[PDB]
């Protein structure tokens, strides 16, 4: 059957015992695996001033990862366009497109979760402002738009524009603008169904996009058995306990996390409830079944698979097992 | 001998496309790495059909993966256009991928066209130096900022100031920065600028002594006659620009024919102590460049080229490495 396709969204977490440089190397390794296994695209997220995420400049990792891979699309998931000149962004992604013809995604995301002093420093001198910037970007990417100057480097075609959101409002905007849309279920699981319904219902065809193109971004923690999956997931659980207490540290090791979560204390992930779990955990069959329900309900063509896994060996396993569960054709 | 480096603006040449230019950059960087060039810098040029790279950071990210010994960096990022924090993050990310191999050369945006500049800015000579001090502070994780500059790793990219004025040389001296002077841009002040940099130098972080580079255009071929043929491209490019004729770099043989006809020859109509562009056989170019390096105290020559044909271009850089006795890697 036409299973849902799988893609990777990489925020490059920094894990206890390692450094941001390890995170970057691990991103490359994951991208090469994802390329070989038949994932559709590999996106790199933008995070600023967080010790636990290694990539504030996705465009730099994109430039590298596209050179290390052949078939997978590579791009941003997403560039925080509110922080930048739309012309600068257009130039950067045109340069990527000129290096990696027709392989580059320009996913654009909201800067609403950037800390205020950091935001102010990145700006160096709003809801609707982003959508305006997004129109400006689309215009800079159209070489016939009648601007008084050229957007270098000019080549036929261009990067594929995507809007990333975690709100019903973003889904309305993506619909209005006729953009492909990726919804972060793992960020706002209370509105996933409504957002994806709204995107599809309100969709107005845009330039290269005659029909809705929905992706669902999900955190998945998959291992051979439910018990092993729960062990790998403990890292994430403890990261949430710790963050709820203002304890900001690198992703903790699984075995340590298992021990901690067996003790009394906050468990924000256990204490909340949505239609679908915020983070999807289990054996290959269990995660496949859960994710397929979610994809059917939302009309998602692909799942953008995010992970918060301490150990690279566990992480690569998760993605390998998922490819097999979704019957991906290798490259 | 003086050391040699490459400064790459990625010209777009008649018959080809910007994508060719980028590929040809990579090819040159691999050759330069093998031949023993010290660093490979990528320049930033906006809204010019004849230069392919508005975002040097993207080509740097690729070229550093394609090479192993040569330093790789910007020559230069137009810092007046950007948040110094964003620039710091971008180059910290490069440093995290390519530890201790990255140069962050910073250049002036005074030659960016005004509507383009306005669009890049999205909303003074001294503003740049202020940004430069902000950038240096963001690159110092002990500077007492209320937040961290990701990704944190030991050390950082090497800051360079690129200039084409005596005032830039004064600023570099004042700030204790390594300095690269664009002789090919402002040949009237090369001697004074390089003298001033050295005389006024105040030691800075990690820079106890002046570290001068001279950036030069070179067009080298096996014989003076072949060099002149390759150089005709550049000559014609200048004739055309003086007439408002903006096109890709022309082919050498066509250019030779055109320059034999009456018409503007801006390069012939000017005169400096040293030629704006250095042209000739290996021996001729070596001798000329060595005089210039001796006079300016340059440790290294940043070699720029405006050559139409990639095989002519690679040849120029191969001949130069041999003439300067570079040790291959
Ligand atoms: Na990673
Ligand atoms: Na960060
Ligand atoms: Na960015
Ligand atoms: Na944004
Ligand atoms: Na593309
Ligand atoms: Na991830
Ligand atoms: Na992970
Ligand atoms: Na080139
Ligand atoms: Na340009
Ligand atoms: Na730049
Ligand atoms: Na500047
Ligand atoms: Na050059
Ligand atoms: Na050239």
XYZ file of C-alpha atoms and ligand atoms in Angstrom:
673
model
C 0.000 0.000 0.000
C 0.850 3.644 -0.272
C 2.280 3.852 3.274
C 3.181 7.233 4.428
C 6.653 8.380 3.305
C 9.333 9.171 5.921
C 11.609 12.169 6.263
C 14.049 13.436 8.959
C 13.893 16.704 10.913
C 17.167 17.253 12.689
C 17.614 19.774 15.512
C 21.065 18.318 16.350
C 20.687 17.777 20.065
C 23.796 17.937 22.240
C 23.937 14.932 24.520
C 25.585 14.333 27.913
C 29.188 13.320 27.506
C 29.583 14.798 24.029
C 29.964 18.207 22.411
C 28.195 20.252 19.726
C 30.834 19.068 17.214
C 29.735 15.452 17.827
C 26.138 16.487 17.213
C 27.061 17.892 13.824
C 29.027 14.790 12.839
C 26.099 12.655 13.969
C 23.766 14.728 11.756
C 25.840 13.926 8.767
C 25.894 10.232 9.638
C 22.114 10.205 10.052
C 21.633 12.013 6.756
C 23.814 9.473 4.887
C 21.745 6.661 6.465
C 18.493 8.378 5.621
C 19.680 8.881 2.063
C 20.547 5.153 1.677
C 17.316 3.976 3.336
C 14.968 6.001 1.135
C 13.832 8.879 3.332
C 12.341 11.699 1.222
C 13.991 14.784 2.785
C 16.351 15.758 5.574
C 15.603 19.047 7.273
C 17.828 20.972 9.661
C 16.160 23.147 12.358
C 17.384 26.510 13.633
C 17.965 26.944 17.390
C 19.796 29.851 19.013
C 21.607 30.095 22.379
C 20.579 26.618 23.639
C 23.367 24.414 25.012
C 21.302 21.375 24.083
C 20.880 22.154 20.332
C 23.952 22.540 18.086
C 22.727 24.362 14.949
C 21.845 28.048 14.900
C 22.704 28.230 11.153
C 20.967 25.391 9.294
C 22.190 26.705 5.952
C 25.766 25.712 6.879
C 24.821 22.140 7.744
C 22.604 21.967 4.618
C 25.551 22.971 2.451
C 27.574 20.105 3.915
C 24.897 17.422 4.054
C 23.824 17.972 0.428
C 27.441 17.210 -0.579
C 27.359 13.971 1.476
C 24.111 12.639 -0.046
C 22.691 12.020 -3.496
C 18.973 11.331 -3.548
C 17.376 12.745 -0.392
C 16.203 16.331 -0.522
C 18.028 18.598 1.987
C 16.838 21.793 3.501
C 15.802 23.974 6.387
C 13.075 23.007 8.873
C 13.043 25.847 9.430
C 14.821 29.141 8.829
C 13.541 31.801 11.271
C 12.693 34.302 8.564
C 11.570 37.011 11.004
C 15.210 37.431 11.945
C 16.576 37.993 8.466
C 16.313 40.022 5.293
C 14.216 38.005 2.855
C 16.735 38.899 0.136
C 19.598 37.438 2.163
C 17.667 34.245 2.707
C 16.825 34.068 -1.006
C 20.490 34.524 -1.933
C 21.634 31.837 0.520
C 19.157 29.310 -0.786
C 19.766 30.235 -4.413
C 23.460 29.518 -3.758
C 22.473 26.115 -2.324
C 20.252 25.475 -5.340
C 23.136 26.379 -7.675
C 25.335 23.801 -5.890
C 22.583 21.150 -5.536
C 20.127 21.654 -8.362
C 16.498 20.972 -7.513
C 17.399 19.234 -4.222
C 16.918 22.097 -1.730
C 13.966 22.822 0.546
C 13.565 26.234 2.111
C 11.371 25.523 5.122
C 10.424 28.669 7.058
C 9.496 28.640 10.724
C 8.306 31.056 13.431
C 10.675 32.926 15.751
C 8.067 33.101 18.574
C 10.097 30.724 20.798
C 13.427 32.623 20.420
C 14.387 34.215 23.808
C 13.854 38.010 23.724
C 17.419 39.265 24.297
C 18.686 36.803 21.690
C 15.980 37.816 19.223
C 16.874 41.486 19.754
C 20.600 40.766 19.140
C 19.854 38.725 15.958
C 17.616 41.491 14.651
C 20.147 44.208 15.313
C 17.256 46.677 14.942
C 4.443 39.922 14.770
C 1.965 37.439 13.320
C 1.423 39.203 10.003
C 5.040 40.370 9.602
C 6.193 36.781 8.897
C 3.597 36.325 6.158
C 4.705 39.594 4.582
C 8.374 38.471 4.680
C 7.321 35.197 3.186
C 5.700 37.040 0.243
C 8.826 39.139 -0.153
C 10.947 35.958 -0.158
C 8.732 34.349 -2.813
C 9.102 37.516 -4.921
C 12.893 37.494 -4.597
C 12.872 33.866 -5.691
C 10.883 34.836 -8.857
C 13.356 36.247 -11.370
C 10.505 37.823 -13.436
C 9.083 39.847 -10.538
C 10.313 43.169 -11.990
C 12.807 44.085 -9.271
C 15.415 46.743 -10.083
C 18.252 44.206 -9.442
C 19.039 40.494 -9.841
C 19.090 37.897 -7.097
C 22.380 36.060 -7.450
C 23.135 33.386 -8.399
C 20.482 33.036 -11.112
C 19.686 29.534 -12.289
C 16.545 27.876 -13.629
C 14.161 26.722 -10.902
C 14.816 27.269 -7.222
C 14.474 25.947 -3.723
C 11.092 24.562 -2.661
C 9.327 26.833 -0.134
C 7.696 25.139 2.881
C 5.935 26.644 5.893
C 6.431 24.995 9.252
C 3.867 25.639 11.955
C 2.570 24.541 15.318
C -0.733 26.444 15.385
C -4.082 26.594 13.614
C -3.204 30.126 12.557
C -0.102 28.924 10.658
C -2.151 26.313 8.896
C -4.592 29.096 7.752
C -1.657 31.109 6.447
C -0.158 28.166 4.580
C -3.580 27.456 3.089
C -4.105 31.071 2.094
C -0.696 31.236 0.409
C -0.893 27.854 -1.281
C 2.223 26.563 0.445
C 3.329 23.088 1.376
C 2.912 22.805 5.134
C 4.586 20.863 7.914
C 2.795 20.723 11.271
C 4.717 20.086 14.476
C 2.512 17.608 16.292
C 5.188 17.099 18.919
C 5.048 20.817 19.781
C 1.270 21.418 19.759
C -0.473 18.033 19.929
C -3.712 19.624 21.230
C -4.466 21.087 17.758
C -2.972 18.629 15.275
C -6.251 17.326 13.890
C -7.831 20.781 13.617
C -4.740 22.351 12.070
C -4.337 19.699 9.405
C -8.119 19.777 8.664
C -7.978 23.585 8.380
C -4.972 23.507 6.071
C -6.742 21.171 3.670
C -10.189 22.837 3.876
C -8.947 26.436 3.430
C -6.281 25.585 0.820
C -5.977 28.023 -2.092
C -3.738 26.732 -4.914
C -0.427 28.593 -5.286
C 2.268 28.883 -7.963
C 3.791 25.378 -7.995
C 1.274 23.896 -5.603
C -2.149 22.951 -7.076
C -3.176 20.780 -4.094
C -2.422 20.664 -0.313
C 0.967 19.162 0.523
C 0.867 18.272 4.236
C 3.712 16.830 6.307
C 3.299 15.825 9.939
C 6.391 16.351 12.121
C 6.536 13.846 14.922
C 8.953 12.729 17.570
C 9.459 8.998 17.379
C 11.428 6.714 19.645
C 11.480 3.238 18.083
C 13.388 0.110 19.216
C 13.043 -3.609 18.576
C 10.716 -4.143 21.590
C 8.409 -1.912 23.618
C 10.668 -2.364 26.660
C 13.806 -1.250 24.802
C 11.847 1.698 23.285
C 10.780 2.780 26.796
C 14.373 2.678 27.977
C 15.556 4.892 25.040
C 12.536 7.229 25.687
C 13.522 7.790 29.324
C 16.078 10.388 28.179
C 13.284 12.504 26.809
C 11.058 11.991 29.815
C 13.850 13.145 32.193
C 14.706 16.076 29.930
C 11.140 17.247 30.418
C 11.173 16.719 34.210
C 14.363 18.709 34.392
C 13.204 21.533 32.151
C 9.999 21.858 34.190
C 12.244 22.516 37.235
C 14.497 25.038 35.405
C 17.298 22.467 35.201
C 18.824 23.068 31.749
C 21.318 20.411 30.752
C 22.350 18.231 27.861
C 20.206 15.208 26.953
C 20.747 12.606 29.732
C 21.843 8.977 29.153
C 19.045 6.429 28.914
C 19.996 4.170 31.857
C 20.471 7.091 34.220
C 17.165 8.503 33.014
C 15.344 5.193 33.614
C 16.562 5.231 37.243
C 15.569 8.867 37.766
C 12.086 8.508 36.299
C 11.387 5.566 38.623
C 11.705 8.046 41.511
C 8.913 10.416 42.565
C 8.871 13.777 40.781
C 7.412 15.793 37.929
C 6.475 13.787 34.838
C 4.986 16.458 32.539
C 4.688 13.937 29.689
C 2.629 11.509 31.833
C 0.458 14.331 33.256
C -0.886 15.550 29.900
C -3.333 13.955 27.512
C -4.182 14.487 23.858
C -5.892 12.518 21.136
C -2.481 11.223 20.039
C 0.626 10.868 22.197
C 2.894 13.916 22.026
C 5.881 11.632 21.435
C 5.391 8.282 19.710
C 7.212 5.407 21.376
C 7.408 1.643 20.940
C 8.193 -1.389 18.865
C 8.194 -1.080 15.084
C 4.656 -2.490 14.768
C 3.292 -0.266 17.530
C 4.821 2.955 16.186
C 3.857 2.023 12.589
C 0.215 1.509 13.570
C 0.016 4.672 15.677
C 1.702 6.829 13.061
C -0.386 5.432 10.219
C -3.606 6.367 12.107
C -2.213 9.878 12.507
C -1.243 10.160 8.874
C -4.649 8.877 7.655
C -6.458 11.353 9.877
C -4.379 14.366 8.900
C -3.869 13.586 5.208
C -0.108 13.670 5.786
C 1.934 12.515 2.771
C 5.124 12.215 4.858
C 6.179 12.082 8.434
C 9.027 14.387 9.440
C 10.701 12.279 12.101
C 12.332 14.088 14.960
C 14.278 12.359 17.721
C 15.627 13.229 21.191
C 17.811 10.178 21.729
C 21.000 10.255 23.801
C 23.023 7.542 22.046
C 23.770 7.671 18.353
C 23.648 3.864 18.122
C 20.129 3.846 19.574
C 19.175 6.719 17.298
C 20.369 5.157 14.061
C 18.537 1.966 15.076
C 15.291 3.899 15.510
C 15.497 5.301 12.009
C 16.534 1.931 10.498
C 13.601 0.149 12.156
C 11.202 2.833 10.948
C 12.362 2.574 7.350
C 11.735 -1.222 7.488
C 8.327 -0.763 9.168
C 7.203 1.697 6.475
C 8.602 -0.459 3.661
C 10.943 2.220 2.383
C 12.757 1.402 -0.864
C 16.527 1.947 -0.378
C 18.574 4.044 -2.806
C 59.606 33.183 -0.471
C 56.296 34.764 0.249
C 53.403 32.318 0.834
C 50.472 32.150 -1.621
C 46.752 32.034 -1.021
C 43.609 32.213 -3.168
C 40.878 34.842 -3.019
C 37.885 33.653 -5.057
C 35.063 35.895 -6.213
C 33.716 33.197 -8.516
C 33.388 35.069 -11.760
C 30.729 34.003 -14.272
C 32.142 33.661 -17.723
C 30.656 33.928 -21.200
C 29.118 30.674 -22.302
C 28.668 29.266 -18.803
C 26.479 29.777 -15.757
C 26.861 30.609 -12.048
C 26.693 26.894 -11.267
C 29.801 26.328 -13.394
C 31.525 29.078 -11.442
C 30.853 27.357 -8.136
C 32.054 24.023 -9.404
C 35.169 25.705 -10.776
C 35.742 27.232 -7.279
C 35.733 23.814 -5.749
C 38.163 22.527 -8.392
C 40.508 25.425 -7.737
C 40.336 24.913 -3.987
C 41.245 21.225 -4.335
C 44.194 22.138 -6.576
C 45.265 24.898 -4.205
C 45.050 22.496 -1.273
C 47.268 19.950 -3.127
C 49.748 22.587 -4.258
C 50.376 24.081 -0.835
C 48.460 27.398 -0.836
C 47.936 28.699 2.686
C 44.246 29.757 2.632
C 41.314 29.890 0.237
C 39.005 32.823 0.724
C 35.573 33.371 -0.817
C 34.393 36.934 -1.510
C 30.859 38.277 -1.169
C 29.278 39.993 -4.220
C 25.585 40.842 -4.538
C 23.360 41.332 -7.603
C 26.185 41.068 -10.159
C 25.595 38.717 -13.070
C 29.361 38.347 -13.377
C 30.070 37.123 -9.781
C 28.389 33.944 -8.511
C 28.669 34.106 -4.687
C 26.569 36.399 -2.540
C 26.860 33.994 0.431
C 30.486 32.983 0.974
C 29.542 31.012 4.057
C 27.776 28.403 1.871
C 30.758 27.859 -0.419
C 33.087 27.826 2.613
C 31.010 25.044 4.175
C 31.400 22.975 0.993
C 35.048 23.749 0.219
C 36.256 22.948 3.736
C 34.744 19.426 3.281
C 36.620 19.045 -0.039
C 40.042 19.963 1.316
C 42.236 18.926 4.217
C 45.202 21.317 4.770
C 44.359 24.731 3.281
C 42.540 27.170 5.578
C 39.117 28.177 4.248
C 37.186 31.317 4.896
C 35.527 34.567 3.918
C 37.353 37.350 2.057
C 35.187 39.001 3.032
C 31.815 38.918 4.752
C 30.104 42.329 4.432
C 29.517 42.754 8.111
C 27.647 46.091 7.762
C 24.771 44.096 6.252
C 24.351 41.627 9.088
C 23.800 41.171 12.803
C 27.243 40.483 14.308
C 25.644 37.734 16.384
C 24.388 35.976 13.244
C 27.824 36.189 11.650
C 29.394 34.817 14.860
C 26.943 31.898 14.905
C 27.526 31.070 11.236
C 31.291 31.024 11.697
C 31.121 29.175 15.034
C 29.117 26.509 13.172
C 31.852 26.351 10.476
C 34.524 26.142 13.207
C 32.592 23.277 14.858
C 32.590 21.379 11.564
C 36.182 22.311 10.597
C 38.111 22.911 13.832
C 40.775 25.605 13.638
C 40.630 25.825 9.800
C 38.203 28.771 9.333
C 39.001 32.386 8.580
C 36.391 35.063 9.175
C 37.577 37.851 6.850
C 35.411 40.976 7.128
C 35.148 43.531 4.296
C 33.487 46.879 3.603
C 30.018 47.239 2.039
C 30.837 50.662 0.512
C 30.720 49.276 -3.057
C 27.304 47.523 -2.659
C 24.655 49.289 -4.877
C 22.244 51.361 -2.739
C 18.909 49.640 -3.496
C 20.555 46.241 -2.934
C 22.171 47.406 0.303
C 18.807 48.708 1.494
C 17.091 45.345 0.685
C 19.846 43.374 2.496
C 19.613 45.603 5.535
C 15.837 45.008 5.929
C 14.103 48.012 7.639
C 29.398 55.146 8.466
C 33.037 53.985 8.346
C 32.907 53.860 12.180
C 29.783 51.646 12.300
C 31.793 48.781 10.746
C 34.508 49.006 13.431
C 31.816 48.958 16.097
C 30.209 45.864 14.514
C 33.655 44.322 14.356
C 34.141 44.839 18.072
C 30.671 43.408 18.739
C 31.583 40.373 16.563
C 34.793 39.869 18.495
C 32.829 40.017 21.750
C 30.327 37.420 20.526
C 33.264 35.177 19.581
C 34.554 35.466 23.209
C 32.520 33.134 25.459
C 33.864 34.929 28.614
C 32.566 38.339 27.587
C 29.716 38.297 30.184
C 26.769 38.245 27.781
C 23.390 37.185 29.177
C 23.249 34.256 26.661
C 25.523 31.730 24.876
C 26.666 31.888 21.284
C 25.968 28.445 19.793
C 27.665 26.120 19.032
C 30.285 26.534 21.761
C 33.643 24.838 21.143
C 37.187 25.693 22.216
C 38.895 28.334 20.033
C 37.162 29.971 17.098
C 37.468 31.319 13.583
C 40.401 33.640 12.842
C 39.249 37.221 12.374
C 40.758 39.164 9.436
C 40.093 42.692 8.185
C 40.137 43.273 4.464
C 40.652 46.811 3.240
C 41.426 48.945 0.245
C 42.194 52.256 2.014
C 44.715 53.800 4.386
C 41.927 54.327 6.927
C 41.173 50.550 6.990
C 44.856 49.889 7.611
C 44.722 52.326 10.582
C 41.673 50.523 11.960
C 43.281 47.100 11.588
C 46.403 48.425 13.335
C 44.387 50.004 16.122
C 42.407 46.784 16.700
C 45.425 44.431 16.431
C 43.877 42.510 13.532
C 45.462 40.594 10.717
C 45.005 42.678 7.594
C 44.632 42.004 3.900
C 45.064 44.956 1.506
C 43.422 44.855 -1.920
C 46.198 46.222 -4.083
C 44.120 45.391 -7.190
C 41.349 47.673 -5.923
C 43.381 50.672 -4.678
C 46.892 50.415 -6.136
C 47.524 54.142 -5.562
C 47.842 53.638 -1.770
C 49.290 50.118 -1.398
C 52.701 51.192 -0.076
C 51.299 53.811 2.346
C 48.544 51.502 3.625
C 50.906 48.600 4.326
C 53.473 50.979 5.924
C 50.738 52.483 8.108
C 49.392 49.081 9.209
C 52.848 48.030 10.404
C 53.810 51.390 11.970
C 50.549 51.918 13.895
C 50.076 48.252 14.910
C 48.849 47.625 18.457
C 49.000 43.951 19.528
C 45.609 42.305 19.956
C 44.102 39.005 21.123
C 46.088 36.208 19.512
C 47.903 38.717 17.284
C 51.179 39.900 18.879
C 52.659 41.197 15.602
C 51.358 42.669 12.321
C 50.078 39.981 9.990
C 49.860 41.580 6.528
C 48.538 39.944 3.368
C 48.608 41.597 -0.008
C 45.684 40.742 -2.307
C 46.641 40.874 -5.962
C 45.224 39.945 -9.328
C 47.600 37.740 -11.225
C 47.394 36.445 -14.752
C 50.260 33.988 -15.294
C 50.968 31.688 -18.253
C 54.016 29.859 -19.594
C 55.120 32.801 -21.808
C 54.474 36.570 -21.721
C 52.545 36.224 -25.042
C 50.206 33.582 -23.657
C 49.753 35.634 -20.464
C 48.746 38.682 -22.505
C 46.189 36.662 -24.405
C 44.591 35.405 -21.160
C 44.726 38.980 -19.737
C 42.746 40.404 -22.679
C 39.525 39.145 -21.028
C 40.135 41.425 -18.118
C 41.155 44.348 -20.268
C 37.947 44.079 -22.325
C 35.849 43.680 -19.204
C 37.110 47.046 -18.103
C 36.513 48.663 -21.525
C 32.947 47.335 -21.497
C 32.214 48.428 -17.930
C 33.446 51.924 -18.653
C 30.780 52.078 -21.421
C 27.967 50.681 -19.223
C 28.161 47.358 -21.024
C 27.640 44.795 -18.214
C 28.244 41.248 -19.314
C 29.905 38.020 -18.322
C 33.718 37.712 -18.630
C 34.555 37.529 -22.328
C 36.590 34.773 -24.028
C 40.301 35.510 -24.461
C 40.592 35.333 -28.281
C 37.548 37.560 -28.820
C 38.967 39.949 -26.247
C 42.365 40.077 -27.950
C 40.589 41.095 -31.225
C 38.451 43.725 -29.503
C 41.341 45.344 -27.640
C 43.300 45.711 -30.902
C 40.525 48.073 -32.057
C 40.348 51.730 -30.980
C 38.416 52.363 -27.802
C 38.576 52.871 -24.075
C 41.402 51.099 -22.300
C 41.019 52.186 -18.661
C 43.831 49.859 -17.536
C 46.281 51.438 -20.047
C 45.152 54.980 -19.142
C 46.266 54.706 -15.504
C 49.661 54.432 -13.819
C 50.823 53.393 -10.334
C 54.048 52.312 -8.646
C 53.037 48.711 -9.204
C 50.688 47.452 -11.935
C 47.082 47.134 -10.803
C 46.971 43.639 -12.273
C 50.126 41.562 -12.462
C 50.575 39.766 -15.793
C 53.275 37.637 -17.443
C 55.462 34.560 -17.506
C 56.258 32.786 -14.232
C 59.593 34.543 -13.853
C 58.162 38.006 -14.651
C 55.266 37.663 -12.259
C 57.437 36.148 -9.533
C 59.913 39.004 -9.707
C 57.211 41.709 -9.722
C 55.270 40.145 -6.843
C 58.410 39.574 -4.779
C 59.323 43.298 -5.049
C 55.805 44.156 -3.886
C 55.926 41.682 -0.988
C 59.380 42.911 0.148
C 58.233 46.585 0.087
C 54.962 45.982 1.930
C 56.140 43.340 4.446
C 53.481 40.966 3.117
C 53.783 37.427 4.488
C 51.399 36.077 1.940
C 49.840 37.034 -1.430
C 46.090 36.526 -1.834
C 45.834 35.677 -5.500
C 42.730 36.826 -7.343
C 41.953 36.027 -10.964
C 39.577 37.198 -13.721
C 40.199 34.496 -16.278
C 37.601 33.188 -18.756
C 38.719 29.601 -19.290
C 39.116 27.206 -16.379
C 42.132 25.471 -17.859
C 43.902 28.829 -18.308
C 42.962 29.697 -14.747
C 44.203 26.475 -13.141
C 47.389 26.804 -15.163
C 48.019 30.266 -13.740
C 47.744 28.989 -10.179
C 49.864 25.887 -10.960
C 52.642 28.010 -12.473
C 52.573 30.376 -9.505
C 52.927 27.544 -6.961
C 56.021 26.299 -8.866
C 57.465 29.819 -9.183
C 57.093 30.414 -5.463
C 58.430 26.958 -4.534
C 55.299 25.924 -2.677
C 55.554 22.548 -0.963
C 52.724 20.297 -2.119
C 50.607 18.600 0.496
Na 22.893 15.288 15.735
Na 21.612 26.626 20.080
Na 19.431 30.824 9.349
Na 10.543 33.471 11.913
Na 16.539 23.296 -5.115
Na 15.763 14.944 15.274
Na 18.123 12.482 18.766
Na 34.912 30.161 -10.058
Na 26.476 38.485 -7.566
Na 27.529 36.571 3.964
Na 30.529 45.628 5.454
Na 39.802 34.956 -8.089
Na 39.144 33.706 -12.840
